[model samples]
Target: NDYPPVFSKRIYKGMVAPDAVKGTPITTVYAEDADPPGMPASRVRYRVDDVQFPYPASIFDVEEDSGRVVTRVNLNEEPTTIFKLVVVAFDDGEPVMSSSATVRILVLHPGEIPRFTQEEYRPPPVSELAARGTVVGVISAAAINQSIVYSIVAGNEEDKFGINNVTGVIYVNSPLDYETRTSYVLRVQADSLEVVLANLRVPSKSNTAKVYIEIQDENDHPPVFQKKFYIGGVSEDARMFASVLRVKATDRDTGNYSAMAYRLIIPPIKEGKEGFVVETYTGLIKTAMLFHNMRRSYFKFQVIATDDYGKGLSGKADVLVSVVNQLDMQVIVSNVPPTLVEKKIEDLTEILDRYVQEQIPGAKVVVESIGARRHGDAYSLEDYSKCDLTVYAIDPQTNRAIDRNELFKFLDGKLLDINKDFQPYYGEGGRILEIRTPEAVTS
Candidate 1:
């Protein structure tokens, strides 16, 4: 009895030329038996296993006595780069034992493999409003009567697109947002069925095609307020045309849909609004009149942010307004002018109140005094000095008293001409101080 032939090496490797002749020796294999020489168990015979790829039992063979690996057929025109086989050596024993070894072979690459048709494919514009499953475009490549399977290999991190494996028709797989991403560059894989020579350790012919996709903008988002509650105020003393507060809003849409117009919804007189105004485009709240002659302590209003010049979609927010009470002022125009006495009617208190009302608007006129300084003209008319009525009332604009020089200058221009300069001082008595008739302004 003898053991199976033990090969010196478990694997053997070699390469086959593209222009090998039929039955030409490409390489040789060797194996040794432990049996003593000259014995039948020491004699070895060699045999090659069948080739299973491309064409079974084809391409190569091995000699039984010499262990020479030979090309079984001519292969000059074949598109192959490698060949692998299994070889076995047997010992002549009672049990007829054998051992196996791997034989790998390589061949030069065959030029001119299949690839993409255009190298790059660009589709038409795809709107972000495109629905799912909408076919954007298709990709194609050429092979010799071979079917190519298509797959996305890169730039589809969001899985936003899907393609048909057989036809390469790319379609939307998820919702598209133009604001999120406006363009995409994708790499597509094209794999043809049935590789040229997989037995040669060559993978299936696979090539990449680039795809360029563009997403168009769509007006989807409406106008929205920047704040949940907009706050602003006006003081009781803030001048007219003064800006109180500004309210703002924005839209996510593009183009004209993003341009905004503004409007303030002020409450009525009975509704607590007193003529506040807002700039139509700037959203600036200005004091118009209600704040001047304010009837209420505070006001509440609404601001609407609108797109399409106040004709499109709109958003609203509560506007909180505060009326700062800087206090209404009481002013006294007390210099008892003789003009009041000369103009005094027989109706006594009626002329004083009436004249004071006509001189100043929006005031509670109170005749504080009458006839402290005497003028000769008032005595000639009503037996009284030109009535020096110290008239003082609510003054909201500015509390500073009017200058006597400006008053005299005003009298010279509009009402009176008195060469007598005004004495700069006065006391509360029947002072015989001579004075010109001027409007009784607080001086």
Candidate 2:
């Protein structure tokens, strides 16, 4: 036959109730063959052609012979309210004549409630030193857009935080003290009301979201040294950068403020004639200049512990270094030179696949092509068997690149707790892979 059967309509619309019973018929598709009116009706077959990812054809099914459409599963109208599908029809002709049409299914709901996109909301820890009215976080949610108004339903004791009614932006209403209260749990609610003409108040539905606000410590405290003086020993002919002493100090604050850097004061350096140097971050003192047994038997210097990378407050202490005479010294030698091995460029998807399989046992994982620009040399992970899939930017134990802050920013609050349990190996130029599960998107 030269002509194929044409669909009666290009677009067909159907509706399925949220409480639709199994096998409930929503609508039927119709098509016509080019056969003459007197001839028998051409036998037509139907099948679904296209559907979005995460949405399977099992949700809706159609009869092959009759074009009858019915719901195969229940529908949740909050996140997914509509489904656009492409249906194809085939006739039992010599060459199998075919035509296609679009079927749009609308999920009907009696009422809609605001739902948070994530299981937990983790705004970046705000510094207690932050000014009042600072924007800590903007709570995100999804619901039927009927002019939703937001409020702080709970966790606001003395009006420490505020939320915009229309925008749902949470800001600091009052000053925060990290020493007094490190964190606060606030419950935010999104309320929606049906339009009413008269003075009668319309019934409203409210959904609450739990917000965990962590107050971060700032560089307000100085580093405290465990001992006022540290004693160490070095050989007279000790090699440069040899560890002479390790001065330990602790900071009361956390983060950058608590992270300590070591520095040798100028007075000690002048007296010893630049005898020692200290590590910038770790409080490890090493021999800077060669020591002479006849010239000096001992050397003393002061080490300073500075917070915020030596830019903020600091504390100082003295280090007494004794020089031991090196008699009948035997020179140690090595004949090894560093060599660079040619690296074979392996597919990142293969690495990620192997990693996920090994790290997460009994869990299925798939890595697709990377679509994100920032995700360099990384494969996109799609469709994990588990709803709560945990991803680590780097294995904290063995990973050379341990930037926990960057990792947290990349994963965001979408994933509940940042996990450091599984340590996966990555090669050169191989950054950590970001494979968030479906539940992460709902946050």
Candidate 3:
């Protein structure tokens, strides 16, 4: 009895694929390994004693020896939900006992959920509102238990707006401006969530919850020309040159002012200076002598900015463009990035700078060192064997965040779209080891 033996090895459990598509191949893991400093070397047996979630054996199967788990489904497979699995492992030598691991699985099916459209929010007019506003929905299930709180709201589209729930209706303050025709979008605080109006809806009794807020269109000042009155005088025989009149309008309203684009209320005569155009940013009206018949005459167009706020209520201001007539087309803007990846905080500053360069032709692409090394988990080649570049292409004209397909279209004439399956290869991530118990010291 002097030579008793003990089993050696750590038995652990974890998911093979934390995120997997329903009716797709997935791996479940129950592993046992021999680690040093505890028990002597020995063979280990791994098995799944229980599964917390439902996975039909006909659909998913566990490998014979290894913990390799998989699913099989034809085209007509029904949708499945996220599930959990538990596995146990034991050493050959034993008190006939073991240890276990549990894994959470999220099974997503193709085309199961709808995709959201892209849109950006102008910075909030009020600093407090900006700081407190949450871009997406707030008063949601998470907030039901006071578990959810919100900060910034972001979105673009009809479905993007909600009062409290993601699917909830939008509530707008009635009788918004109709004369200045001002309609202000009210920011909502649904518990901890802030929602924007994409498709405003009259509050219903069916939905007990409603976002509370007040919005008012303040008339800071009537729109005025950036310059008092732009004046340009070109020679009568000036073949084709810049327009003589260049005027701009300004409003004290916050987001409305910045996002407002100008349009010529009264257009210039088609006969003369018909090719004249106004710059959206700097209100410099210029002419492109496209027409053969060039009449060196000054024309006037009352330009006005219509602040529709995407709603019927809007404001109008008159702009005067004095066309002095100038040259043909002016060359502008040039470079485009292959792609950009916002992996870290440094990417933000680089993106802002890149945005400026994206709009200019001679602007050089600044090589920026991005991504944080220590703050969070760093993405590296060692973790992923597949070819994946963390960069995205940004459209200069639209300021849109480009994706893989768009990037491909930029490089090649056309782009091919591809769907991905479960992620088999796991990447390295940081683990903040938490101490369970304080160490005891004795002198």
Candidate 4:
């Protein structure tokens, strides 16, 4: 009454094709109970122990009478490696005498069967702005040790989608446009062949799968200004809404159109954003009521354009405005430089060096126009940019200025626009023609 059934064998092994259906018996598992025969303790039934098996309990089932092992579902989803199962035998006796067997089963492909690991392949939506060669996903199939090559056979236009020869990597080969094509179902083929046998290889069956490469819309273009450096003019007494200058910006991204927005970013010292304003539609810089009493003579600001009608990734340009109050309708030049009048026959390097050290930074250069003036009043500081003056030399013998009859040494001067229409003075750069009575007195 206290005897437990002892199993004659403790280990068994089997194989199931990866393509088997549910409840299809794959192999047999057995255990013997030694209860001295004819007793109820000798009669046995078998089952997979749910608590004993380390793998998924739902994967396997057993026939109680004959100890035949079968699948609860298809075997393709399980790993390629063998599955270890625990099968238990119970006898119809008091306290249910029992023994167990370690049953191992493998996912066999049955010759050369190539198949994907998944029922359906899906990838996340890709952006239309994604560059070429961007990876969509990696696909995989198993054929034991054979090489599985993947390809996009159908739904691939112009070969836009490409797959790795052995790795089964799906990648973009060309630019994707969401407005043109939204969703894609690429039928991919996975064919298997033997690897590296010099020239001979074994051919196997091919398996095909469909992949969904969803495409998403992208806003990738920006509003472009005609020029990033704008020169605009305004007045100190400019009236409200008076137009100062207009800007042009066009966006390259099409289909969805929003009115381009124009905004003014004035300098902090030039009052608030109200000092200068821009039109949202026309991109025109108009005078605000606050622009009238503005103190700055020149206003520098930023003009910005948005394709979204606001500011995300918008384009901007620099704006320079000269605010003036001239009574005459004169062409108000930007700035007037002063005439640097000096008398010298020295090298221009000394002149440039002096000007480099003395001249104010933004005031343009002034060379010796001995050159000069503006259209302003007679004493309007004579705005000009000219350098050193010419000091005429006199001949000591004639007690008067000498006309060029011949040339000599302190002196070899040079030119000719063919001929000297206007006879310019001949003298060495550093030393003027100071004709002091020649001591040689002979040429």
TM-scores of the models, in the order given: 0.46, 0.36, 0.22, 0.33
Candidate that scores best on lDDT: 1
Local accuracy by lDDT, each model: 0.61, 0.57, 0.34, 0.56
Considering every candidate listed, which one attains the maximal TM-score?
1
Is 1 or 3 the stronger prediction by TM-score?
1
Once model 3 is optimally superposed onto the true structure by TM-score, how far is the C-alpha of residue 166 displaced, in angstroms?
Answer: 32
**Please, what are the lDDT tens digits per residue for candidate 1 over residues 323-344?**
5332211212224455544344
Candidate 2: C-alpha lDDT: 0.57
Model 4 TM-score? 0.33
Which residue ranges in model 2 land beyond 4 Å of their true spot? 1-125, 138-149, 157-159, 164-167, 177-185, 191-206, 212-220, 231-244, 253-257, 266-272, 279-282, 286-300, 308-313, 320-443
Instruction: Show pairs that collide, candidate 4.
Output: 366-385, 366-386, 367-386, 367-387, 368-387
Per-residue alpha-carbon lDDT of candidate 4 for residues 1-443, written as tens digits (9 for 90 to 100): 34555445576655555666677665676666667677787787887776766563478888888877788886465436677778877888887878777767766554454678764589898988888989998888886767766667688875667888678898888888866777888887665564223321212223657898898766666778987766544545566777767787776555343337888888675334465678787888877654455433556788888776674448888876654332201111112122322333234323322332232222111121232333345324444542222211222222222221221111222212201311222222322212122211224
lDDT (Cα, tens digit) per residue for candidate 3, span 168-200: 333321223323332233332222222122221
**Once superposed on the true structure, which residue ranges of model 4 sit more than 4 Å away at CA?**
1-123, 127-135, 138-147, 152-167, 172-187, 194-223, 233-238, 246-262, 268-273, 280-282, 290-298, 306-311, 322-443
User: Model 3 off-target regions past 4 Å?
Assistant: 1-224, 227-230, 237-246, 266-275, 290-297, 308-443
Q: Ten residues in a row with the worst lDDT in model 1?
A: 415-424
Instruction: Report the Cα RMSD per candidate.
Output: 24.3, 24.9, 28.1, 24.0
Between candidates 2 and 3, which one is better according to lDDT? 2
